[PDB]
Design a binder for this molecule. Sequence first.
Ligand SMILES: [C-]#[N+][C@@H]1[C@H](c2c[nH]c3ccccc23)[C@@H](C(=C)C)CC[C@@]1(C)C=C
Ligand SMILES: O=C(O)CCC(=O)C(=O)O
Ligand SMILES: [Cl-]
Ligand SMILES: [Zn+2]
Length: 275
Amino acid sequence: ALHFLDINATEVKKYPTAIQDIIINRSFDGMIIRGVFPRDTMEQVARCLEEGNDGGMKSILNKNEEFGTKVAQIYGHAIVGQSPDLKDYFASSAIFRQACRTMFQGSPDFEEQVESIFHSLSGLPVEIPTGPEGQTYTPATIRLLLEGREIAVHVGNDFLLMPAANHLKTLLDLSDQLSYFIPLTVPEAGGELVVYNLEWNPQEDAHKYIDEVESKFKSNQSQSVAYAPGPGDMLLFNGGRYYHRVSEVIGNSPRRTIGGFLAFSKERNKIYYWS
Ligand SMILES: [C-]#[N+][C@@H]1[C@H](c2c[nH]c3ccccc23)[C@@H](C(=C)C)CC[C@@]1(C)C=C
Ligand SMILES: O=C(O)CCC(=O)C(=O)O
Ligand SMILES: [Cl-]
Ligand SMILES: [Zn+2]
């Protein structure tokens, strides 16, 4: 249904227009990049988190208790479902980048590594958007999926229609919004990204959003594909256009991903990435 590449991170230099090709030319829909981060780094970082020895990352952990099991616990305020003012977002964002830099210990640094991937696939500058008064957006959040939890079906271009995105809209292109994530830890089973042939309908509170995509999606039958990247593999895809979810986690070992999103600037002069 959907066309996904599977390449090694050593090869990224050879796909200088991958991001153009996914968003603009629509010539394929996504991409697994193996070994963007070493497995060592991924274990170190996961152990920093589970031991609570994490640069204080735990203090910006949203347990999302009131959602039950169709959502991740998330470290960092994700831009989604935030008030339009963004005071908490921007505060959380400064903390995240600190704790994250600390956990990666430059071996390699998260932001440096990811930016060089996005650079290699665009030939463009890559930046974390800055806010209207010079605040920083978070480059990423960390998603924790315990046993029996999943991420409910959703589509990413919807996010840029929420009040939270007002400011960011003023920076970005019309065009689609990619999703990216790297697993830190993968579960024994489940926790797969399932992507659907079904596209964001531009004709058309994250509680009522999830109940109203569940009935929208179950109206259509459409074709699916599933991906289960390993620790340190990046999955990068047109999650803006295509409905997708993450399947229930099976077994004790939980699923931890670090990820966000990715889009062209106003004039396609550069890439922005955030969560
Ligand atoms: C899981 N997850 C998030 C989104 C999400 C669901 N409840 C939330 C509460 C606060 C902040 C973000 C969320 C999710 C949905 C909107 C259904 C999409 C994926 C993810 C990881 C996005 C950042
Ligand atoms: O697995 C994750 O970290 C989130 C997957 C997803 O739905 C996304 O990145 O948009
Ligand atoms: Cl998404
Ligand atoms: Zn998504």
